[PDB]
Amino acid sequence: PCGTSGGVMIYIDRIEVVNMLAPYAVFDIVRNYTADYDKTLIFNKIHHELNQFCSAHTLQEVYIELFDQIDENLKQALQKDLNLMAPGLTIQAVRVTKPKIPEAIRRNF
Amino acid sequence: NAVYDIVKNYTADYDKALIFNKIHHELNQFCSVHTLQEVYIELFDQIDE
Amino acid sequence: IAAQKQKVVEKEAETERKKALIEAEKVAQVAEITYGQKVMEKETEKKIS
Amino acid sequence: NLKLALQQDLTSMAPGLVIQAVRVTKPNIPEAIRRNYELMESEKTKLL
Amino acid sequence: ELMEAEKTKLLIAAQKQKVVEKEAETERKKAVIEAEKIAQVAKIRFQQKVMEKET
Amino acid sequence: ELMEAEKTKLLIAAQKQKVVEKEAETERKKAVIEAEKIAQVAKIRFQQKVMEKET
Ligand SMILES: *[C@@H]1O[C@H](CO)[C@@H](O)[C@H](O)[C@H]1NC(C)=O
Ligand SMILES: *[C@@H]1O[C@H](CO)[C@@H](O)[C@H](O)[C@H]1NC(C)=O
Ligand SMILES: *[C@@H]1O[C@H](CO)[C@@H](O)[C@H](O)[C@H]1NC(C)=O
């Protein structure tokens, strides 16, 4: 889900993340966060980061205008935390599908 | 020559994650900037490029 | 509840005010065009006389 | 703010237990209020 | 609950006013175009009248 | 019992006083806005009248 600044909810159907960690950081990564570091570090924060990004933008900006930048903003948000907390793991890319909008708004468009 | 490096960096099924997982995102990014008329009629021949 | 219905009513009244102003300006411009036409008609009437 | 409050409470009572992060989902606003929010957005597109 | 409904109803009107303004402006433009049509038709009619009086 | 019911009825009236005062104030504000609208519309109309008289 993503609650836009207009007070309406739009559900982004699929948010994919492509990541990779340097070999030398494997020991430390598994020591710190086990083998589930992906779920511990990326895909649990995804929804909160998306909500934070959406709360400052309207339905138009997220759905149409700033869709070119949703992925870049989310990738930067994830990498900012990962760099400091778990060095070695990097987010090579992020991908997002077009958000779903209510029927009434879709009809007007 | 680059086959060895490509298969090393990414599994044999590289093409999926390298092209066909990004196709939809790139197309959505392209469409977000162009109106329906441009994509459907006018700018259609430029979608490939 | 009344303290907020007050603001709602104020906003609706302001909207009505803006609509009325737009209508008045429309009438003004239409009248300007009509009176230019009247002047032209009067000139032609002078020529006819 | 919630993380700050929890950490401030813990720092003295139970030193050594650090609260790294906090996350929250968006609240569930009532149906009547939610309907108005949708109506607002419907007007933003009626202008177009 | 109603007190909170009024807070959002204020926001709906802020956009409904823009919608009303746009509709009124469209009506104004239509009326102006009609007035110009009438003016040009009158011009043609009056040239015809001048020719009529010469004949 | 009715004697004690009347004692509380006094407080309900005390609150209804403020409620009706707020409603009347809202009506006053609405009427003032309408009067301002009429004034501005009349101003535009009379500028139009001056132009018409010049023509
Ligand atoms: C593991 O945790 C330690 C202690 O917090 C930190 O210094 C180190 O950078 C971490 N390493 C990785 C790979 O997460
Ligand atoms: C594989 O990844 C390395 C990382 O340094 C890069 O330099 C190299 O060009 C890549 N080779 C491929 C993709 O064939
Ligand atoms: C345990 O309680 C004592 C007594 O208040 C306190 O001094 C100490 O810091 C506490 N330690 C932890 C780990 O909570």
Numbering used by the authors:
A (entry chain A): 77 to 185
B (entry chain a): 98 to 146
C (entry chain l): 195 to 243
D (entry chain m): 147 to 194
E (entry chain M), F (entry chain L): 186 to 240
Would you copy out the relevant sentences from the publication that reported this structure?
Stomatin, Prohibitin, Flotillin, and HflK/C (SPFH) family proteins are found in all kingdoms of life and in multiple eukaryotic organelles. SPFH proteins assemble into homo- or hetero-oligomeric rings that form domed structures. Most SPFH assemblies also abut a cellular membrane, where they are implicated in diverse functions ranging from membrane organization to protein quality control. Here, we report single-particle cryo-EM structures of the endoplasmic reticulum (ER)-resident Erlin1/2 complex and the mitochondrial prohibitin (PHB1/2) complex, revealing assemblies of 13 heterodimers of Erlin1 and Erlin2 and 11 heterodimers of PHB1 and PHB2, respectively.
The two Erlin paralogs are highly similar (74% identical) and are each predicted to have an N-terminal transmembrane helix followed by tandem SPFH1 and SPFH2 domains, two helices (CC1 and CC2) predicted to form coiled coil interactions, and a C-terminal region (CT) that resides in the ER lumen. The overall architecture of the Erlin1/2 complex is a domed cage-like structure with a height of ~165 Å extending into the ER lumen. We therefore modeled 13 heterodimeric pairs of Erlin1 and Erlin2 based on the hypothesis that the predominant arrangement of the Erlin1/2 complex would also follow this pattern. We could build a model for the entire complex except for the extreme N- and C-termini of each Erlin protein (residues 1-18 and 310-348 of Erlin1 and residues 1-17 and 308-339 of Erlin2) and could also visualize and build N-linked glycosylation modifications on N108 of Erlin1 and N106 of Erlin2. The interface between adjacent SPFH2 domains is stabilized by two hydrogen bonds: one between a histidine (Erlin1 H124 or Erlin2 H122) and an aspartate (Erlin1 D147 or Erlin2 D145), and another between a serine (Erlin1 S131 or Erlin2 S129) and a lysine (Erlin1 K174 or Erlin2 K172). Following the SPFH2 domain, the 101-residue CC1 helices interlock through hydrogen bonding and other electrostatic interactions to produce a sealed wall of 26 helices. The narrow end of the Erlin1/2 cage forms a 4-layer structure. After β9, the CTs of alternating Erlin subunits extend in opposite directions. One CT (modeled as Erlin2) forms a short helix and extends towards the outer edge of the cage. The other CT (modeled as Erlin1) extends a flexible segment towards the inside of the cage, leading to a central channel-like structure with an inner diameter of ~12 Å.
